[PDB]
Amino acid sequence: SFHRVDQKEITQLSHLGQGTRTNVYEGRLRELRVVLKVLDPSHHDIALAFYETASLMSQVSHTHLAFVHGVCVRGPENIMVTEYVEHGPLDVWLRRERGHVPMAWKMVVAQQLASALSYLENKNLVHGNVCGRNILLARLGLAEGTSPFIKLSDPGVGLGALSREERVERIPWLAPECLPLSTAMDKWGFGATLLEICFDGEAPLQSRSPSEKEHFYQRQHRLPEPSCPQLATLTSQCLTYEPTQRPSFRTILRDLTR
């Protein structure tokens, strides 16, 4: 159950990057500013999972969830059409602007992200790809008199269909119980994303090889506590290996607002 987008209705512009089994381009939709996520040549089950993401994210709404417009099926190309959010991914922005972003700014985006994930929890819908790359900046909020505004993008190809190798590369955003689907995984993803934001877009463990990322989870080592000193109790509660011990998003949002 998703919108079929006819190929006459879209224009493809420049290449922005590569997502999980995708090439991502800027585009136009007749007009709206969009991103075009072109799937790799794939087995039908990967294409199904791609369609499933588009279907689920088409039937939810939130101020801090980016729009999904539909899928264009050119034969045998599959292209998801989604919102272009003006200032792009949070991780790249933070790295370019590092040492100019105050703590108070970071508290605002954490609250906004927790709001969106509170709604998804209430809807009992798994995201499965909460990370800096999928947080998009609609307003910058650094100028005097302003505050930032973010949007969480769709998860792309559903986590359930990816290979073990791909799951290892998503450490430490990936919930440990997903290494060998519940809404509990998104608590861990959220916690990992808060560390990423606090470290100015440098996630922990990203200078290490895949086998060393996996080994860290095998031993069950505890991730570092944030440079944002207020957040430490919260990130550690989110990043606990036992999923049932992680707090609800009602509790997370409540604690962040004060």
75 and 89 fall within a common domain: no
Q: Which residues contact 254 (CB under 8 A, 6 or more apart)?
A: none
Last residue of one domain, picked from the residues 57, 84, 111: 84
120 and 27 fall within a common domain: no
220 and 94 fall within a common domain: yes
Query: In this structure, what CATH number is given to the domain that contains residue 121?
Result: 1.10.510.10
CB 93 within 8 A of CB 134: no
146 and 43 fall within a common domain: no
Q: In the sheet where 22-29 sits, what is the strand order? A: 10-19, 22-29, 32-39, 78-83, 68-73
66 and 158 fall within a common domain: no
113 and 65 fall within a common domain: no
Cis amide bond preceding 226, omega within 30: no
Task: Kindly provide the resolution of this structure in angstroms, with one decimal.
Answer: 2.2
- Crossing angle between the packed helical segments 103-123 and 185-198, to the nearest 10 degrees: 170
254 and 126 fall within a common domain: yes
- Helix intervals (H) in the chain: 44-58, 90-96, 103-123, 164-169, 185-198, 210-219, 232-238, 249-257
102 and 223 fall within a common domain: yes
159 and 90 fall within a common domain: yes
In whole angstroms, give the CA distance from residue 226 to residue 242. Answer: 20
80 and 126 fall within a common domain: no
In whole angstroms, give the CA distance from residue 156 to residue 47. Answer: 11
CA atoms within 13 A on the CB side of 27: 23
72 and 102 fall within a common domain: no
Report residue 90 CA to chain centroid gap: 10
59 and 77 fall within a common domain: yes
Last residue of one domain, picked from the residues 84, 109, 130: 84
Q: List the domain range (segments joined by +) for residue 60.
A: 1-84
Last residue of one domain, picked from the residues 30, 51, 84: 84
Q: How was this structure determined?
A: X-ray
- Please state the domain count of the chain: 2
Query: In this structure, what CATH number is given to the domain that contains residue 6?
Result: 3.30.200.20
Classify 88 in phi/psi space as left (phi over 0), alpha (psi -120 to 50) or beta. left
